Motif scaffolding. Sequence first.
Motif, mmCIF file in Angstrom:
data_model
loop_
_atom_site.group_PDB
_atom_site.id
_atom_site.type_symbol
_atom_site.label_atom_id
_atom_site.label_comp_id
_atom_site.label_asym_id
_atom_site.label_seq_id
_atom_site.Cartn_x
_atom_site.Cartn_y
_atom_site.Cartn_z
ATOM 1 N N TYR B 8 0.920 -1.125 -0.033
ATOM 2 C CA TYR B 8 0.033 -0.022 0.213
ATOM 3 C C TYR B 8 0.836 1.040 0.048
ATOM 4 O O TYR B 8 0.469 2.163 -0.560
ATOM 5 C CB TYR B 8 -0.942 -0.093 1.349
ATOM 6 C CG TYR B 8 -1.603 -1.313 1.429
ATOM 7 C CD1 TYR B 8 -2.603 -1.886 0.626
ATOM 8 C CD2 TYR B 8 -1.066 -2.099 2.620
ATOM 9 C CE1 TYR B 8 -3.099 -3.202 0.934
ATOM 10 C CE2 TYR B 8 -1.700 -3.286 2.856
ATOM 11 C CZ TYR B 8 -2.748 -3.880 1.844
ATOM 12 O OH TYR B 8 -3.336 -5.063 2.086
ATOM 13 N N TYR B 10 3.833 1.273 -1.314
ATOM 14 C CA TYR B 10 4.347 1.254 -2.765
ATOM 15 C C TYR B 10 3.216 1.915 -3.637
ATOM 16 O O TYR B 10 3.530 2.770 -4.590
ATOM 17 C CB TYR B 10 4.698 -0.036 -3.049
ATOM 18 C CG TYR B 10 6.006 0.137 -4.001
ATOM 19 C CD1 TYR B 10 5.855 0.277 -5.446
ATOM 20 C CD2 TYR B 10 7.236 -0.209 -3.485
ATOM 21 C CE1 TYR B 10 6.712 0.322 -6.476
ATOM 22 C CE2 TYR B 10 8.297 0.153 -4.563
ATOM 23 C CZ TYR B 10 8.153 0.454 -5.997
ATOM 24 O OH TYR B 10 9.188 0.423 -6.732
ATOM 25 N N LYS B 11 2.026 1.563 -3.394
ATOM 26 C CA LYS B 11 1.014 2.118 -4.228
ATOM 27 C C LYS B 11 0.995 3.875 -4.335
ATOM 28 O O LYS B 11 0.739 4.481 -5.233
ATOM 29 C CB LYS B 11 -0.445 1.634 -4.148
ATOM 30 C CG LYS B 11 -0.591 -0.033 -4.554
ATOM 31 C CD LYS B 11 -1.726 -0.497 -4.099
ATOM 32 C CE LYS B 11 -1.870 -2.133 -4.637
ATOM 33 N NZ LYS B 11 -3.433 -2.346 -4.596
ATOM 34 N N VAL B 12 0.882 4.316 -2.939
ATOM 35 C CA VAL B 12 0.830 5.480 -2.865
ATOM 36 C C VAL B 12 2.093 6.217 -3.309
ATOM 37 O O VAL B 12 2.044 7.412 -3.848
ATOM 38 C CB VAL B 12 0.713 5.907 -1.078
ATOM 39 C CG1 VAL B 12 0.894 7.377 -0.973
ATOM 40 C CG2 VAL B 12 -0.289 5.093 -0.575
ATOM 41 N N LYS B 14 3.755 5.303 -5.904
ATOM 42 C CA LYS B 14 3.670 5.579 -7.222
ATOM 43 C C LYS B 14 2.628 6.485 -7.634
ATOM 44 O O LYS B 14 2.695 7.253 -8.490
ATOM 45 C CB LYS B 14 3.188 4.059 -7.753
ATOM 46 C CG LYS B 14 4.393 3.010 -7.835
ATOM 47 C CD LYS B 14 5.400 3.079 -8.751
ATOM 48 C CE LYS B 14 6.680 3.548 -8.245
ATOM 49 N NZ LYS B 14 7.739 3.682 -9.004
ATOM 50 N N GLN B 15 1.707 6.835 -6.493
ATOM 51 C CA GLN B 15 0.757 7.777 -6.862
ATOM 52 C C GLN B 15 1.604 9.189 -6.885
ATOM 53 O O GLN B 15 1.275 10.023 -7.850
ATOM 54 C CB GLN B 15 -0.449 7.875 -6.086
ATOM 55 C CG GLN B 15 -1.499 6.900 -6.319
ATOM 56 C CD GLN B 15 -2.615 6.994 -5.357
ATOM 57 O OE1 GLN B 15 -2.376 7.421 -4.156
ATOM 58 N NE2 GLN B 15 -3.908 6.699 -5.816
ATOM 59 N N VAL B 16 2.342 9.509 -6.019
ATOM 60 C CA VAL B 16 3.047 10.817 -5.779
ATOM 61 C C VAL B 16 4.281 10.958 -6.525
ATOM 62 O O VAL B 16 4.466 12.167 -7.018
ATOM 63 C CB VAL B 16 3.190 11.048 -4.395
ATOM 64 C CG1 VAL B 16 1.968 11.052 -3.475
ATOM 65 C CG2 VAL B 16 4.299 10.022 -3.723
ATOM 66 N N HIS B 17 5.057 9.967 -6.695
ATOM 67 C CA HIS B 17 6.296 9.962 -7.547
ATOM 68 C C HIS B 17 6.598 8.697 -8.400
ATOM 69 O O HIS B 17 7.144 7.753 -8.059
ATOM 70 C CB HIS B 17 7.453 9.969 -6.568
ATOM 71 C CG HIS B 17 7.678 11.411 -5.996
ATOM 72 N ND1 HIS B 17 8.011 12.437 -6.872
ATOM 73 C CD2 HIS B 17 7.477 11.754 -4.808
ATOM 74 C CE1 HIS B 17 8.019 13.638 -5.957
ATOM 75 N NE2 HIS B 17 7.877 13.156 -4.571
ATOM 76 N N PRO B 18 5.774 8.697 -9.597
ATOM 77 C CA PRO B 18 5.727 7.575 -10.383
ATOM 78 C C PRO B 18 6.856 6.742 -10.874
ATOM 79 O O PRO B 18 7.142 5.435 -10.923
ATOM 80 C CB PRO B 18 5.096 8.061 -11.721
ATOM 81 C CG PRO B 18 4.118 9.240 -11.412
ATOM 82 C CD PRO B 18 5.047 9.824 -10.028
ATOM 83 N N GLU B 81 -9.574 14.429 4.556
ATOM 84 C CA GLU B 81 -9.507 13.285 3.663
ATOM 85 C C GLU B 81 -10.380 11.801 4.373
ATOM 86 O O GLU B 81 -10.890 11.260 3.715
ATOM 87 C CB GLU B 81 -8.035 12.712 3.538
ATOM 88 C CG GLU B 81 -6.990 13.495 2.911
ATOM 89 C CD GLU B 81 -7.330 13.616 1.458
ATOM 90 O OE1 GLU B 81 -7.417 12.411 0.825
ATOM 91 O OE2 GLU B 81 -7.692 14.318 0.791
#
Lengths: 283, 91, 102
Positions: B8, B10-12, B14-18, B81
């Motif tokens: 999770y 890592y997913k985040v 990837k969201q903020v810094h691909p 949020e």
Amino acid sequence: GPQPISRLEQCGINANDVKKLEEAGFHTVEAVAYAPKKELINIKGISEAKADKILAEAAKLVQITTGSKELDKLLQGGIETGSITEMFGEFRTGKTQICHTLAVTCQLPIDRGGGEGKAMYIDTEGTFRPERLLAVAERYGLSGSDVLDNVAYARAFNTDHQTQLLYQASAMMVESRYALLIVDSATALYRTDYSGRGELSARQMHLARFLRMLLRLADEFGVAVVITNQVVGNIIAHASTTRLYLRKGRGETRICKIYDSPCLPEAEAMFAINADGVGDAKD
Amino acid sequence: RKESYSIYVYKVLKQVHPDTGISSKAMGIMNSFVNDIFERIAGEASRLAHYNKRSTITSREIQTAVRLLLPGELAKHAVSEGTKAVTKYTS
Amino acid sequence: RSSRAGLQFPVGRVHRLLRKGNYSERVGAGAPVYLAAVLEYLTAEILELAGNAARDNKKTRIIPRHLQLAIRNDEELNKLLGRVTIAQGGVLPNIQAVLLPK
DNA sequence: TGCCTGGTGTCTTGGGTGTAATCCCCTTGGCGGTTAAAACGCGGGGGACAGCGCGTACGTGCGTTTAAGCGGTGCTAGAGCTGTCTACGACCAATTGAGCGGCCTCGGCACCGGGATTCTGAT
DNA sequence: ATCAGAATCCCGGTGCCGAGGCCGCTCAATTGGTCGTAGACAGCTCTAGCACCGCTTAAACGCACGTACGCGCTGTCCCCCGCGTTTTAACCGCCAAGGGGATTACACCCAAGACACCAGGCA
């Protein structure tokens, strides 16, 4: 003993607040003191400040003959009033008979081995017989009717009822002089009610509370506490002062053994069960 | 087996810094972080519920706990949020 | 159970508080006894020292000051209650030596 | 026609907690080199520290004033308790797909080396 | 300002190993339904918090004054830094072994019950 709540007013609680505390059912400074504030506050017309003053100022203030002579000698003369004496033995040893006998001997003059007090028979087994009491009374030359008049009787149907009868016993024993409290098949309700293995602690707890109430009443009224136990709990060891083992000799004559007394020897005495009485063995 | 927040995180990431990765040690620190904040918020929420004689921890307890534990802007954005997420979830 | 454990502190009540404090799903029979015993002991140590201070001050009643004196003058109690404020306790008398006249 | 008197044998679980036997791989142990770091010596410089002077800010005292405190009284907002009921969360069974362990690979980073730049100290 | 030397920064090349992705699987989250209960809301009580007035008096406040202490300056000497040389043991790599962490196999207590089996002749 008690420390009647009257003494709380001299601490400077106003008397109206003491009357409100008495209305709640608190009648001693000991009673109000070791209770929290909210009990006294919940009373109508009592604020928290008066309750704080109450709690703060309140903390400042707060031998019956067995009728067997040989057994009496074994016991050094008979049951000591004010203490619990346990007689554990088989069925048909005369436990019920002994209870009936003591229910009358307690009423005997102290010089005759009585306590000159009324008797209390708490039955759990249905074996209460006023006619047996009449026979024992005529044996010792006591009025059988007066024996029944000096015996308040109630059959406990369960352990909860068994403990509930102690509440009536405590208030009733204040009004009249008693000398004997009888609990016959005292352990049966702890076996029928508490039958599980996980429930061992539960029956032990109920018994412990029962014993503590017994000790309080014994120390309060100086009466003899007699309970009967069939041994086919380790909690009773500390609680019983004198442990008596009863076994049958054939006919109506029974063998008694002492299995605990911190002061009295381990010893045995022979006695008989006679129509009139629980009485010494007469071969 | 042995749980962590690694996938999770890592997913985040990837969201903020691909095009950015993360070392094993750094991921361990992120996992420590998430567990820490979880414990802080859950514990405060537990006390909130207890103080008020409630047997249920609801989003309101979470929100109050967040207000107690997080400073200033972090608290405001976190509250935003959480509220948004609960609103999207409910429908 | 308190009488069975030889205690003054309430085992039953402690058990109930453990059950309803959501500490664990299950609670052993010995746990509230142990806890009650510990709470009672610590209470006894603080009251012992505070009583001592009260008598040193020729007072028969313990006040917060005596509790503070008892706690701060005892290294281990002071450690245990290191981040605790005793209301109306004051502080230990202590003047740095350099501040005194020559 | 009418008669008594003889002992000695077995064999059977159930419930809910504590113990050793098992076993395997990492934690512990050792060998060997090699190199970077620790230990040691020494010179010196700069910083700790003691002494001194001064001036100013703070402690002490006193008269004034200001408001905190105490005591009484009033009322109303709101804490607290009780009753009722409905929404909501525990629980449980079936399903399944998200998440985890394992395997593989390639690219980010690290190590090496060499030139550039910075920065420091003596002039 | 200058300049040389020591240290660091940067740039490029090579390698390597750990992060990223894929795949099998399995068990934990989801869905659907039921049921008890807890907490949301209404309503009533009654406590205590807020507001106020008045009097008193002790605390705050303003100011005067003197002086002790903070602070700046100076000298001294000592002891820590920085650097060169020697030593040593931390670190890398490799191997052995065993011990303890995780898995499977094993008593003590109270409980009472249950009947069977006929044989042998004389005076």
